[PDB]
């Protein structure tokens, strides 16, 4: 062979007729094949067991997962048992007669659109409470989240105004829109005056053991509730992109449509083909959608209230030459205290721990400009920002 | 055990059967549906007038509520049985965890894990380039031992040495 | 007495010969073992990334099954979302108080009284009256009823007796399926004596080359015994009436083919005449009109190619009519399900061959294979003219789920 | 990811609802659905009639028609009164206890397999698709292991065959050992006598049971045919030419016939 004649040279490195050294050279080949079969032995074994678990789980999930979706044939075909049978009574008069008055929400919309006008005109000051804190509103979990649910009752005029898009009448969002002027933006912005003044009140050096507790509790309740709410509306365009773009974009239309689909395939038509994936039924069901910026879009102003207070504490001179990170890193210490104090306050949102590293963008970007050129003390240029690099590292998690 | 059960049906439930069945005429007359946006527009709010639809609706609340004497314990039963689609389809989503994700990707991927790094793709060659080499060790151990022995000690016993020279003809063949 | 050998340890030792003897041939077996080692590491890295990408080339179809099944992830999260949010609406709907003893008390009034359909206890009226040995063979009371009464003997979970706060079969489970499996132990020994008896009649059934057609119509008289859903072999006994009873009664069919197929021996002596016809062919050719026809080739007359449709068909009695012993394995034990209901109607298999999607194992193909090949052994003119014969034999069985592929691999 | 994704909202809502079932009649001061059949009261989000089954006293081998029936009429009467207005006369929650009980089940005919659902949620219709196509993709894996698993079985089969001839040294040899011994000397006679004595050890491996070792049967078969060959050689010699120690040749036919028709005597 092309190896064997070369191996005839390797054993022709023993002489020409060299039967003793041919024997020993064969023992060398036995050493080579010996270790090559030790590693090829165990390596082949590991590959074989990999094939064993591979076909063992292709087996175990072919059969068992075929009986997991076919266990969904068992239990989900068991779902089809009592389709027109269950609840042993007049369910036909429960879903078409007793649920006919569920299509009769008129007087609740008149006294609650009217009371949403007047009482949120009152909650444009009462649930928009400020001046100064008195526990941040006082009590912005009462106050600013009262403006959140008052804006969730006016999410009928904010988020379910985008669900009631020509449902049955014309003044449901027009005569109630002047009832939403003091109703929606006097509750949502009341929750945003209470939310920007909540996180701004949480940007107030304590801030406080009950002020940031209530205020941040509103800014995690309506923050994460707003996140699952607009995530239920973006999953109404993603559950409609899952659903109506499995209907309009089946593809069997096959034009598709002009021009309420592509765009907006798939949204696709509110009340209820574009709404009921965030509306009834729908056990949520509005989606909420309070408050949008409790700290759902207003937790950036808390870590940017220590990273805008921190970046604001630069005083770019640098007030001796590099005292930007003195007050800025002091606002980073207040960013750790306000951060851990606010995670002690609010688990879901409102500056859990990002105020520290946001203030490290404030001290990082701040110290990368006070001595950018030789405009600071050039003999004390790297010692200052490096001393706050390693020291302000050692003053935190580093 | 016969387990003779005495619920409240066929005397209670006849009020659900007959008085909530007024919706054939009462619910079709007031027409309280399509949509719940009457006084959101602040126009009519009746409309008109959801009293007979509240005679059938309240006949579901009271006449099928007095029928719900022991049937508000027993309408009240597929809260753990109409969730059969909730026990399975998420299990089908778990199966979609297992099959749309874990069977295909564990199949072709957990298949393709033990790959080259065998390695064998080197080493089985290195086994072969040992093995055949060791073959041409031992065969050349044979022929070089053969003609020196056969002509030497099998001087006498002819036609036993014919075997040996045949094997040298093969080993050098 | 039947150690870890004789499971084709004959065919293992049939590498070259057990003809004196050899430990030298044991070394030859070590050489064939290393040959398989490089062919199987060769299969390993052949399939380890290369045909593991061939398995990714399979995951076109298989990840495509995860793609329609990824619509089943959208159908499963669509149905699981409709039932997730709608079942949350059930969690607030029925449980308005919740308080299930005040809002959903169909089962809180009835923590055991809703599970009160356990009155079929216990034994043993129709277990032996509706089946003497049987009363069956007309979809009758031992097929339709006493079978399903033995399914009630298995619907009775005989070790899940009371749970004494429920207490359905506390002392009723002491002799429910002990008298139903005592009387059906007498019906079980009745079908066991009907298995050795009716299978000894199948041993008398040797209809037409070979064919055990009396074992096929007699196998129609055994589908009810293996359907018989309790379940059917309660203690591996009905299959032992289908296999351990057919253990010696494979060797009536196996001894039948063994003495049968090895008797077609007839040959020529010396054919220099036909080499003077393929020497006379090239004499008057071409340069002339041929010469040959195609001429002989006297081996083309089916001296051994007859078995290629006969001992591949009798090998397909060791395989494919043993895949009609896939109508007699248990049968095809499936399916009747209460307890002889569906196979009370549907007890007619083909069974051979017929497709390939399963996982199973069988026997009764050793000596027909070794007889066909070892018969074909000293064949020095073949397989030159029998190229597509023995290679058609190589490429015989792709698409069945039978071991005829391993026969085609033996071929 | 609970909006929507069908699982985290089902785990949070529907599985926070599960402990709400576990403390509905159980934590109603105190397991008021039963009479303490279980302290943890499994499960009370369903029946669990082997765990919580004490709605009245009996609960006996046949007296579940006595008091568990009187539990059905008892709490169906007390719940016929109290449940007439607990969720009874306010039956919007019972119209919803029929809505998400039957109309959600009417959507579970559309969340079935399949049947007349749409049917273009593709689940629906292969619920055993991992068997319908991935036992077919696993049948492409049967084309894979058609090489590889057969390589594993013939592999360990050949290694076990090395164990098998490793488990047979005097036997499964001794065809050429006693055969070459046979024509050699007498065969010593011990190279037939002692050789088929110590081989009659393992020829009684082939005789203390035989089923169905046609290997070992072939072994003592060729032992038999060779022994007959030295038999007919022996009496052929001592008969025809008759030139040796005559008592020795009659000892050869004597002992060789003794063992030969001793094993034929066992046959």
UniProtKB/Swiss-Prot annotation, chain A:
The modification N-acetylserine is found at residue 2. The keyword rRNA processing does not apply. Its main location: cytoplasm. One of its GO terms (molecular function) is SNARE binding. GO terms for cellular component: cellular bud neck; cellular bud tip; exocyst; mating projection tip; prospore membrane. GO terms for biological process: exocyst localization; exocytosis; Golgi to plasma membrane transport; negative regulation of SNARE complex assembly; protein transport; vesicle docking involved in exocytosis. Keywords: Acetylation, Cytoplasm, Exocytosis, Protein transport, Transport. It is found in: Cytoplasm. The exocyst complex is composed of SEC3, SEC5, SEC6, SEC8, SEC10, SEC15, EXO70 and EXO84. Belongs to the SEC6 family. Component of the exocyst complex involved in the docking of exocytic vesicles with fusion sites on the plasma membrane. Present with 1080 molecules/cell in log phase SD medium. This is Exocyst complex component SEC6.
Swiss-Prot record, chain B:
It comes from the Eukaryota. Residues 93-127 form a coiled coil. It is found in: Cytoplasm; Cell membrane. Belongs to the SEC8 family. The exocyst complex is composed of SEC3, SEC5, SEC6, SEC8, SEC10, SEC15, EXO70 and EXO84. Component of the exocyst complex involved in the docking of exocytic vesicles with fusion sites on the plasma membrane. This is Exocyst complex component SEC8. It comes from Saccharomyces cerevisiae (strain ATCC 204508 / S288c) (Baker's yeast). The lineage of its organism: Eukaryota, Fungi, Dikarya, Ascomycota, Saccharomycotina. The gene is SEC8. The chain holds residues 22 to 194 of 1065 of the full protein.
Curated annotation (Swiss-Prot), chain C:
Signal peptide: none annotated. The exocyst complex is composed of SEC3, SEC5, SEC6, SEC8, SEC10, SEC15, EXO70 and EXO84. Component of the exocyst complex involved in the docking of exocytic vesicles with fusion sites on the plasma membrane. Belongs to the SEC3 family. Present with 377 molecules/cell in log phase SD medium. This is Exocyst complex component SEC3. The gene is SEC3. The chain holds residues 618 to 1028 of 1336 of the full protein.
Curated annotation (Swiss-Prot), chain D:
Residues 59-118 form a coiled coil. The modification Phosphoserine is found at residue 120. It comes from the Eukaryota. Belongs to the SEC5 family. The exocyst complex is composed of SEC3, SEC5, SEC6, SEC8, SEC10, SEC15, EXO70 and EXO84. Present with 3400 molecules/cell in log phase SD medium. Component of the exocyst complex involved in the docking of exocytic vesicles with fusion sites on the plasma membrane. This is Exocyst complex component SEC5. It comes from Saccharomyces cerevisiae (strain ATCC 204508 / S288c) (Baker's yeast). The chain holds residues 65 to 331 of 971 of the full protein.
